[PDB]
Design an enzyme around this catalytic site. Structure first.
Site, PDB file in Angstrom:
ATOM      1  N   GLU B  36       0.819  -1.203   0.000  1.00  0.00           N
ATOM      2  CA  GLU B  36       0.000   0.000   0.000  1.00  0.00           C
ATOM      3  C   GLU B  36       0.862   1.266   0.000  1.00  0.00           C
ATOM      4  O   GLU B  36       0.485   2.288  -0.571  1.00  0.00           O
ATOM      5  CB  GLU B  36      -0.959  -0.040   1.188  1.00  0.00           C
ATOM      6  N   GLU B  84      -2.272  -7.686  -3.446  1.00  0.00           N
ATOM      7  CA  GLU B  84      -1.590  -6.411  -3.247  1.00  0.00           C
ATOM      8  C   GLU B  84      -0.083  -6.513  -3.430  1.00  0.00           C
ATOM      9  O   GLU B  84       0.532  -5.639  -4.045  1.00  0.00           O
ATOM     10  CB  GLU B  84      -1.931  -5.840  -1.871  1.00  0.00           C
ATOM     11  N   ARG B 118     -11.105  -8.353  -0.316  1.00  0.00           N
ATOM     12  CA  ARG B 118     -11.757  -7.433   0.615  1.00  0.00           C
ATOM     13  C   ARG B 118     -11.979  -6.056   0.012  1.00  0.00           C
ATOM     14  O   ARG B 118     -11.352  -5.691  -0.991  1.00  0.00           O
ATOM     15  CB  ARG B 118     -10.894  -7.263   1.864  1.00  0.00           C
ATOM     16  N   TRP B 160      -9.936   3.101  15.702  1.00  0.00           N
ATOM     17  CA  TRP B 160      -9.203   2.839  14.462  1.00  0.00           C
ATOM     18  C   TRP B 160     -10.062   2.954  13.188  1.00  0.00           C
ATOM     19  O   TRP B 160      -9.607   3.521  12.185  1.00  0.00           O
ATOM     20  CB  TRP B 160      -8.543   1.463  14.535  1.00  0.00           C
ATOM     21  N   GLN B 253      -1.225   2.738  10.475  1.00  0.00           N
ATOM     22  CA  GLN B 253      -1.117   2.892   9.044  1.00  0.00           C
ATOM     23  C   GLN B 253      -2.309   3.305   8.174  1.00  0.00           C
ATOM     24  O   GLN B 253      -2.199   4.212   7.343  1.00  0.00           O
ATOM     25  CB  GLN B 253      -0.505   1.614   8.486  1.00  0.00           C
ATOM     26  N   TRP B 303       4.250   0.611  25.318  1.00  0.00           N
ATOM     27  CA  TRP B 303       3.932  -0.769  25.681  1.00  0.00           C
ATOM     28  C   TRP B 303       5.215  -1.590  25.984  1.00  0.00           C
ATOM     29  O   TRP B 303       5.347  -2.226  27.047  1.00  0.00           O
ATOM     30  CB  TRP B 303       3.158  -1.389  24.521  1.00  0.00           C
ATOM     31  N   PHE B 356      -0.070   3.980  23.018  1.00  0.00           N
ATOM     32  CA  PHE B 356       0.753   2.848  22.636  1.00  0.00           C
ATOM     33  C   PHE B 356       2.053   3.368  22.012  1.00  0.00           C
ATOM     34  O   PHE B 356       3.154   2.903  22.329  1.00  0.00           O
ATOM     35  CB  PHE B 356      -0.071   2.018  21.647  1.00  0.00           C
ATOM     36  N   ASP B 365      -4.990   4.283  25.499  1.00  0.00           N
ATOM     37  CA  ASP B 365      -5.728   3.043  25.634  1.00  0.00           C
ATOM     38  C   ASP B 365      -5.590   2.485  27.046  1.00  0.00           C
ATOM     39  O   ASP B 365      -4.576   2.666  27.716  1.00  0.00           O
ATOM     40  CB  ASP B 365      -5.303   2.009  24.568  1.00  0.00           C
ATOM     41  N   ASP B 367      -5.245  -0.519  27.969  1.00  0.00           N
ATOM     42  CA  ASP B 367      -4.219  -1.543  28.117  1.00  0.00           C
ATOM     43  C   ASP B 367      -2.898  -0.913  28.520  1.00  0.00           C
ATOM     44  O   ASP B 367      -2.306  -1.292  29.537  1.00  0.00           O
ATOM     45  CB  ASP B 367      -4.032  -2.339  26.828  1.00  0.00           C
ATOM     46  N   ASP B 368      -2.436   0.048  27.726  1.00  0.00           N
ATOM     47  CA  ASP B 368      -1.190   0.735  28.025  1.00  0.00           C
ATOM     48  C   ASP B 368      -1.265   1.457  29.365  1.00  0.00           C
ATOM     49  O   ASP B 368      -0.336   1.371  30.178  1.00  0.00           O
ATOM     50  CB  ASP B 368      -0.853   1.741  26.930  1.00  0.00           C
ATOM     51  N   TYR B 411     -10.123   1.594  23.805  1.00  0.00           N
ATOM     52  CA  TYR B 411     -10.138   3.039  23.631  1.00  0.00           C
ATOM     53  C   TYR B 411     -11.416   3.745  24.102  1.00  0.00           C
ATOM     54  O   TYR B 411     -11.379   4.923  24.465  1.00  0.00           O
ATOM     55  CB  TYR B 411      -9.920   3.363  22.154  1.00  0.00           C
ATOM     56  N   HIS B 442      -5.757  -7.188  32.731  1.00  0.00           N
ATOM     57  CA  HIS B 442      -4.623  -6.310  32.996  1.00  0.00           C
ATOM     58  C   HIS B 442      -5.019  -5.190  33.921  1.00  0.00           C
ATOM     59  O   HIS B 442      -4.271  -4.840  34.817  1.00  0.00           O
ATOM     60  CB  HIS B 442      -4.076  -5.742  31.680  1.00  0.00           C
ATOM     61  N   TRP B 480      -6.216  -9.434  22.136  1.00  0.00           N
ATOM     62  CA  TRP B 480      -5.024  -8.768  21.627  1.00  0.00           C
ATOM     63  C   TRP B 480      -3.745  -9.597  21.651  1.00  0.00           C
ATOM     64  O   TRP B 480      -2.684  -9.107  21.293  1.00  0.00           O
ATOM     65  CB  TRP B 480      -4.809  -7.454  22.387  1.00  0.00           C
ATOM     66  N   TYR B 486      -2.897 -16.867  25.949  1.00  0.00           N
ATOM     67  CA  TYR B 486      -2.677 -15.460  26.269  1.00  0.00           C
ATOM     68  C   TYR B 486      -3.741 -14.940  27.226  1.00  0.00           C
ATOM     69  O   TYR B 486      -3.429 -14.286  28.219  1.00  0.00           O
ATOM     70  CB  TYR B 486      -2.709 -14.622  24.992  1.00  0.00           C
ATOM     71  N   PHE B 592      -6.572  -8.294  14.768  1.00  0.00           N
ATOM     72  CA  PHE B 592      -8.001  -8.568  14.733  1.00  0.00           C
ATOM     73  C   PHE B 592      -8.164 -10.062  14.587  1.00  0.00           C
ATOM     74  O   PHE B 592      -7.588 -10.662  13.687  1.00  0.00           O
ATOM     75  CB  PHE B 592      -8.666  -7.909  13.537  1.00  0.00           C
ATOM     76  N   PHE B 596      -5.908 -10.029  11.089  1.00  0.00           N
ATOM     77  CA  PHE B 596      -4.675  -9.259  11.165  1.00  0.00           C
ATOM     78  C   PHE B 596      -3.890  -9.666  12.401  1.00  0.00           C
ATOM     79  O   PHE B 596      -4.374  -9.492  13.528  1.00  0.00           O
ATOM     80  CB  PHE B 596      -5.033  -7.776  11.253  1.00  0.00           C
ATOM     81  N   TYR B 600       5.093  -9.166  18.059  1.00  0.00           N
ATOM     82  CA  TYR B 600       5.678  -8.249  19.016  1.00  0.00           C
ATOM     83  C   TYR B 600       7.080  -8.745  19.272  1.00  0.00           C
ATOM     84  O   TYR B 600       7.289  -9.724  19.986  1.00  0.00           O
ATOM     85  CB  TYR B 600       4.884  -8.201  20.322  1.00  0.00           C
TER      86      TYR B 600
HETATM   87  C1  LIG Z   1      -1.741  -5.885  23.614  1.00  0.00           C
HETATM   88  C2  LIG Z   1      -2.007  -4.570  23.722  1.00  0.00           C
HETATM   89  C3  LIG Z   1      -2.118  -3.637  22.529  1.00  0.00           C
HETATM   90  N1  LIG Z   1      -2.947  -2.437  22.815  1.00  0.00           N
HETATM   91  C4  LIG Z   1      -2.108  -1.384  23.453  1.00  0.00           C
HETATM   92  C5  LIG Z   1      -3.647  -1.890  21.573  1.00  0.00           C
HETATM   93  C6  LIG Z   1      -2.761  -1.255  20.463  1.00  0.00           C
HETATM   94  C7  LIG Z   1      -2.390  -2.289  19.363  1.00  0.00           C
HETATM   95  C8  LIG Z   1      -3.191  -2.045  18.069  1.00  0.00           C
HETATM   96  C9  LIG Z   1      -2.241  -1.792  16.879  1.00  0.00           C
HETATM   97  C10 LIG Z   1      -2.836  -2.383  15.583  1.00  0.00           C
HETATM   98  O1  LIG Z   1      -2.692  -1.420  14.531  1.00  0.00           O
HETATM   99  C11 LIG Z   1      -3.655  -1.504  13.545  1.00  0.00           C
HETATM  100  C12 LIG Z   1      -4.923  -0.914  13.770  1.00  0.00           C
HETATM  101  C13 LIG Z   1      -5.961  -0.969  12.779  1.00  0.00           C
HETATM  102  C14 LIG Z   1      -5.685  -1.630  11.552  1.00  0.00           C
HETATM  103  C15 LIG Z   1      -6.487  -1.866  10.356  1.00  0.00           C
HETATM  104  C16 LIG Z   1      -7.913  -1.448  10.065  1.00  0.00           C
HETATM  105  C17 LIG Z   1      -8.885  -2.426   9.692  1.00  0.00           C
HETATM  106  C18 LIG Z   1     -10.232  -2.050   9.413  1.00  0.00           C
HETATM  107  C19 LIG Z   1     -10.624  -0.682   9.502  1.00  0.00           C
HETATM  108 BR1  LIG Z   1     -12.397  -0.167   9.141  1.00  0.00          BR
HETATM  109  C20 LIG Z   1      -9.644   0.298   9.875  1.00  0.00           C
HETATM  110  C21 LIG Z   1      -8.300  -0.085  10.154  1.00  0.00           C
HETATM  111  C22 LIG Z   1      -5.680  -2.552   9.522  1.00  0.00           C
HETATM  112  O2  LIG Z   1      -4.434  -2.773  10.089  1.00  0.00           O
HETATM  113  C23 LIG Z   1      -4.398  -2.225  11.331  1.00  0.00           C
HETATM  114  C24 LIG Z   1      -3.369  -2.166  12.324  1.00  0.00           C
END
Ligand SMILES: C=CCN(C)CCCCCCOc1ccc2c(-c3ccc(Br)cc3)coc2c1
Ligand SMILES: C=CCN(C)CCCCCCOc1ccc2c(-c3ccc(Br)cc3)coc2c1
Ligand SMILES: CCCCCCCCOCCOCCOCCOCCO
Ligand SMILES: CCCCCCCCOCCOCCOCCOCCO
Lengths: 619, 619
Positions: B36, B84, B118, B160, B253, B303, B356, B365, B367-368, B411, B442, B480, B486, B592, B596, B600
């Protein structure tokens, strides 16, 4: 005779050109910039001892024997300026005793204290908590709700005022206070018996605005103001949208400083716009050789380069001179191609103008656009394609910018509303941007270089404008240059360029007026007092610039072979320095008639060169 | 026995600490970021040949023998990702013949071509003109008009998704096209016979949304859309207000890239925000030692530092260790003190959370914030005043962020609307931010460290939440982190900290489940497939991190002196490297569930150290 003078001038200018290809002399104003800077730094809690030091040296260095500071060198003491320079120094460290502090203080008092100063000054003081906010004219965030065609909507104000207002409504909305440490408190600015002689709105104060203001301060007191949150955010957004590329706002000191204060108010110091706004400031500062430091009200790179080129060409250098090419290429890269605030009144107008400073896309001005397009026109650049195209875009933009009366303003079209001039806030300088004789004149001469003459209806309406504005004695006012010598030189030079007949009565009536003001020394001069009292029109110590202006009028009117004409050329030839430049301890630039003057550093070198080039031409 | 392992892990971690005092390992994801990026560069007309080169190396380097790319190492081929990566390479230069391009192309085809990918993927293609905009789900600028309490207003989406939507409405509003040169056109992505197996909205599609989408596509065609100009400006403004300090948007991103495209769309490349956005990108890039270049989905400094500290302390270092102090001081300077989007649902909540990444104030967040506040709690810093204060603000913010069910989201509070999951656009990953077992866990362990227990109503409602969410086999999902290992590790460790009784049935039922999954090698592992198919829960190649998580569960449940327990500690001791670190060729982080995954980088070193520290504690 003069040939050596010209050669010395040409080589001098050429040595002043920066590597990138442009010229850029500093812009002089007065000490309110630096004084306000010190306060801004205190508000933002970012005081650098070392800088404060450089600023003190400068403030002092600018004070006169009487202990006062003025708006222009050799000008009357100014109260606002002095009051601000005073507070600045007291903050930086000087005790109220010290010789300098003493003189100034007493001058201030003999004037009626702080109560006699302009709105801004009392407002700044209000910000550090040395003046009550209730006594400061109110400009509400809600002003943001007025539509495009409503009384007092932000687009009825001039570009410079507009941004300042928007920024300020957020600040006035919160009426914040950033306390000065006890050492710097200035109660003594109140200790006076003299009656406070207050300055009122620029155009007069109707009791309406007076009531309205009282209303607003009343409304301020309420525990709840519906939709105010939104008004604020509207203002903030308006600002976020227009931030210039250097971090400034408009490329001018006021809105920039206020926008930063507003952001700070909204806890946005961690935000990009702020950071960029803050650090952009350095580019405007100047290190003075005697250890001082000044801050420019604005910067004039484009303008300086445009004129530099025209002068060097009129002087003789080839339209393809590898050095003028550097300039041309650089100027081409400056052209603004996106819509600015001007598009609110001209949505179908293609972007093509230029700004005064380096990167300020939302506010191009007709003056710069006319000088740049014209100077380009006189060159031969490698890419004739872009030169052709840019001139075209520029040309069109200018034409589309012409106003109702047939004359051009600076930033807007028909920004002639008389409403804003009556508000309690607007007691300093200009607030609207109506057409002026000098911009109109420059525009005319630009078209003239292309060929367009009196035949074309555009030019006719302009000349009509000019003729209707001429003064009884045959002179033309000078809106952006000091003063009648500046205007008259501009107009006649223009008319001559668009084909009008120099023999006409009104043209001659002007050319005579020029000749009638020549100083004994052979040159011409006009003091800034000529805005305040008419006795000074065409009167003042001779300057290289003002002499060059009067000369251009003559050379354009055919009297190039006159007495006054050759006499003046003598003055320039003599007063020239060994390096090739000239000196000019006086300001010949106008910020706002009567309230703000400017020293265009390059003027003393560029206009003499231009006038001498046009003299050598008439032979 | 392990003591030497522990000392080698400790000295290793310390060597990883940056000078400023923090830790920061890269975040691994998949090639869609880099692919991308390449397209983004083409759209912004800012292609750097050298960078493209490093990117090509990386992309190939990541391609597997079959010629496909996956979401996680050792995972199934992913179509979207592969499509892609494919286009990216073809743009960079590779001809469709080359061994790699060949393999990939056939895979893509065997899947039903581009029509099976997608929304994002087809949209990106729509942007360079290789896919029709009409076939891309529509998200209108007008969405910006929905109020705070209306179906589908932008605050019903997860943080997000929210920013991505806002940014996209401006882009979808103009449906722009930035043509690829003929060499890179990819018609071949259509050349397939396989039936296009389309992916639908994450939660199923009501014919309503389908209808609504068709409607919005028709409306697009009209010659006039009233108030659209405004919706666009409402969106742009929403964006200009929230830009992060590094120039990103949200520090992730997607929205970042889209926000940049939108500004490019609105002729704002000469604006501060755009420039800051563009140059901020470099901070996220990473030079790979084999000549490649990757771009991080996000960055994890805070983090990483928070966990690093907790692990080193559990390991033994003094709460005032000068190296842990560098960390503490640094963490204190990170605390966010202004309102973010969370305040829309909690206007009377004082700011006190942490983000983060480095500078992302509008999106802290839970978590952090729980890990940072907790880690701070275990240190003795010089300025006890600020440590005391920061912990309190943080602590209160967390308590105030608790949701209705008694658990915490990441969040927002109660970002549980089910509406957004059905729109035609939302076919990838999570879209709302509901409470999860791991964040809740946590948070609990954070309060636990302060002594708060089961007596406090807040903690009770949380444990209630956790108990109700436990799985039949006694495990807890991992939102997460990957996955049940986990979650289970997180929950049991937490419950133990807030005083609950480890002897309870449900606690034991979990501790059993942990022992039940130990691999033959003595460690524990859980493949990312465990999100897709249940047969993989608790199953997978052992990793240092997942072993550490299962260990913490045991050590917290009293079984620290168990077989499985000591067996696991053996695994960590054996597999440790000579330098003191560990290896982990698998992802153990979740972006996700199902769509995704994340690697780490610090997990492999920090959790083993943390688990070993807690083992040495239980003796
Ligand atoms: C353990 C603890 C972690 N926490 C502190 C949370 C922070 C970690 C999250 C980082 C992930 O980064 C991302 C976030 C969003 C996306 C997307 C995306 C998908 C669908 C839509 Br609608 C919008 C965005 C794609 O890649 C990502 C990466
Ligand atoms: C020959 C040609 C010059 N032209 C190209 C025009 C550019 C010169 C103008 C630069 C002067 O800069 C400023 C502008 C505004 C202010 C103000 C101010 C006063 C009242 C309000 Br209400 C708002 C702003 C103060 O100092 C200035 C300097
Ligand atoms: C984003 C919607 C497009 C609206 C801009 C078209 C301009 C119409 O003329 C109105 C004048 O407004 C002045 C704007 O310049 C300031 C920056 O606005 C940024 C992007 O439009
Ligand atoms: C200008 C008035 C300030 C109003 C905002 C404070 C109200 C609480 O926030 C509501 C939602 O917005 C949260 C996002 O923060 C982003 C940027 O806002 C910055 C300036 O207000």
């Amino acid at each position: 005779a003069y040939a050596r003078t010209l050669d010395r001038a040409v080589e001098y200018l050429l040595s002043c050109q920066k590597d990138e290809g442009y010229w850029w002399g500093p812009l002089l104003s007065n000490v309110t910039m630096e004084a306000e800077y010190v306060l801004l730094c205190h508000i933002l809690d970012r005081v650098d001892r070392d800088r404060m030091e450089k600023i003190r040296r400068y403030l002092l260095h600018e004070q006169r024997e009487d202990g006062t500071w003025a708006l222009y060198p050799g000008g009357p003491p100014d109260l606002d300026t002095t009051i601000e320079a005073y507070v600045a120094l007291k903050y930086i460290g000087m005790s109220r005793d010290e010789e300098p502090m003493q003189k100034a203080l007493r001058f201030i008092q003999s004037q009626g204290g702080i109560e006699s100063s302009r709105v801004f000054t009392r407002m700044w003081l209000a910000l550090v908590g040395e003046y009550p906010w209730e006594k400061v004219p109110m400009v509400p965030p809600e002003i943001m709700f007025l539509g495009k065609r409503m009384p007092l909507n932000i687009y009825e104000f001039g570009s410079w005022a507009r941004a300042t207002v928007v920024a300020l409504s957020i600040v006035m909305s919160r009426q914040p206070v950033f306390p000065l440490p006890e050492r710097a408190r200035v109660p003594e600015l109140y200790e006076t018996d003299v009656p406070p002689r207050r300055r009122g709105a620029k155009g007069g104060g109707g009791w309406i605005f007076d009531a309205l203001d009282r209303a607003l301060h009343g409304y301020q007191k309420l525990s709840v103001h519906p939709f105010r949150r939104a008004a604020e955010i509207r203002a903030l957004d308006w600002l976020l949208e227009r931030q210039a590329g250097d971090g400034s706002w408009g490329g001018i000191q006021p809105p920039w400083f206020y926008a930063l204060i507003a952001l700070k108010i909204l806890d946005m110091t961690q935000h990009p716009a702020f950071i960029k706004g803050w650090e952009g400031l350095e580019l405007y500062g100047v290190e003075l050789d005697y250890g001082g430091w000044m801050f420019q009200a604005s910067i004039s790179p484009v303008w300086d380069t445009g004129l530099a080129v025209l002068a060097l060409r009129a002087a003789g250098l080839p339209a393809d001179h590898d050095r003028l090419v550097k300039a041309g290429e650089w100027l081409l890269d400056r052209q603004i191609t996106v819509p600015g605030d001007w598009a609110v009144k001209r949505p179908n107008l293609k972007p093509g103008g230029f700004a005064f400073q380096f990167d300020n896309v939302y506010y191009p001005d007709v003056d710069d656009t006319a000088v740049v397009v014209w100077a380009l026109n006189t060159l031969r650049l490698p890419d004739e394609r872009r030169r052709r195209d840019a001139m075209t875009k520029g040309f069109r933009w200018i034409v589309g910018m012409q106003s109702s009366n047939g004359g051009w303003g600076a930033y807007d079209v028909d920004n002639t509303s008389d409403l804003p001039n009556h508000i309690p806030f607007c007691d300093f300088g200009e607030v609207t941007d109506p057409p002026s004789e000098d911009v109109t004149a420059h525009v005319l001469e630009c078209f003239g270089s292309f060929g367009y003459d009196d035949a074309w209806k555009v030019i006719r309406r302009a000349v009509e404008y000019l003729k209707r504005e001429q003064k009884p004695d045959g002179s033309w006012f000078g809106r952006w240059g000091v003063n009648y010598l500046y205007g008259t030189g501009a107009v006649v030079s223009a008319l001559k360029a668009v084909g009008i007949d120099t023999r006409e009565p009104y043209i001659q009536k002007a050319l005579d007026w020029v000749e009638q003001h020549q100083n004994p020394d052979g040159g011409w001069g006009e003091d800034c007092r000529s805005y305040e009292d008419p006795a000074y029109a065409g009167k003042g110590a001779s300057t290289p610039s003002q002499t060059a202006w009067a000369l251009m009028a003559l050379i354009a009117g055919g009297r190039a072979e006159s007495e006054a004409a050759r006499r003046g050329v003598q003055y320039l030839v003599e007063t020239q320095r060994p390096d090739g430049g000239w000196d000019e301890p006086y300001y010949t630039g106008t910020g706002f008639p009567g309230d703000f003057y400017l020293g265009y550093t390059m003027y003393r070198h560029v206009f003499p060169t231009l006038a001498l080039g046009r003299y050598k031409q008439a032979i």
